[PDB]
């Protein structure tokens, strides 16, 4: 708003996985107030990923988010008779939020049966750097880099 910033609400660390990250994904996939259901889906996906790989699910998630972390956005502006996109830098928190939203959205509309295996496959693809979120990040990066001339 016009009257300065608004502090962001804090989060708690999950007893099962002591990191704010897992709570962040639960919050992002939470819909209709079913926090327990979101936790169940994320735990099933993480257990599936651990079953398929062997390494720690939080480490796989960290690899995935580091791979899908973007650098610049393409926020647009209009001055006169035309509108053009302006590539600007992104803060780490905003980049993490955008990548998590992209991952969740692409896992929601995948061609599988349940979100356990859907999110397991999505996080594994993001960890290996070949998934839908990675493709979206590459597209955003290149289409923003194509507008480097208008960098005011």
């Amino acid at each position: 708003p016009r009257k300065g910033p608004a502090p962001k609400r804090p989060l708690v660390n999950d007893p099962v996985y002591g990191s704010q990250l897992v709570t962040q994904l639960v919050n992002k996939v939470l819909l209709k107030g079913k926090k327990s259901l979101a936790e169940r889906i994320v735990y099933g996906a993480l257990e599936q990923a651990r079953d398929k790989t062997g390494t720690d699910p939080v480490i796989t998630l960290k690899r995935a988010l580091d791979n899908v972390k973007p650098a610049l956005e393409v926020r647009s502006r209009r001055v006169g008779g035309a509108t053009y996109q302006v590539p600007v830098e992104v803060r780490p928190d905003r980049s993490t939020t955008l990548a998590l939203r992209w991952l969740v959205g692409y896992s929601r509309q995948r061609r599988e049966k349940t979100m356990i295996e859907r999110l397991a496959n999505e996080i594994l693809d993001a960890s290996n750097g070949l998934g839908a979120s990675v493709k979206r990040r590459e597209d955003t990066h290149k289409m923003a880099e194509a507008n480097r001339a208008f960098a005011h």
Binding site: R148, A149, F150, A151
Partner: protein, 117 residues
């Protein structure tokens, strides 16, 4: 297939383009790479990014043809002057003295009518 260790650099920075040509001290052009010569078209040719990349193209062509140092003559009320200068400096070329050679008519030819946009 020439060798001109010393030469001259001319930058013409206007409101619609930016031309960077590199000549020998006698003024014979060796390279002339421009904002339009590099990938650009429309009004983007007058952008500082376009001017600086055209300077990069001109500098690399001069390096290929065998030029190590050039003096710079600039003219025109363009915004790519300093960016082109910096690119020519830190793209493998030395600029030395910087001089402005913008023509100054002593009240000669009548200018066109003012814009009524």
């Amino acid at each position: 297939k020439k060798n001109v260790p010393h030469g001259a650099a001319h930058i013409k920075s206007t409101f619609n383009n930016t031309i960077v040509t590199i000549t020998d001290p006698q003024g014979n052009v060796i390279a002339w790479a421009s904002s339009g010569h590099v990938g650009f078209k429309g009004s983007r040719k007058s952008t500082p990014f376009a001017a600086q990349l055209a300077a990069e193209n001109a500098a690399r062509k001069a390096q290929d043809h065998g030029v190590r140092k050039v003096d710079v003559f600039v003219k025109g009320p363009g915004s790519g002057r300093e960016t082109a200068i910096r690119s020519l400096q830190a793209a493998g070329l030395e600029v030395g003295a910087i001089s402005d050679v913008t023509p100054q008519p002593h009240n000669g030819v009548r200018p066109p009518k003012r814009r009524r946009v």
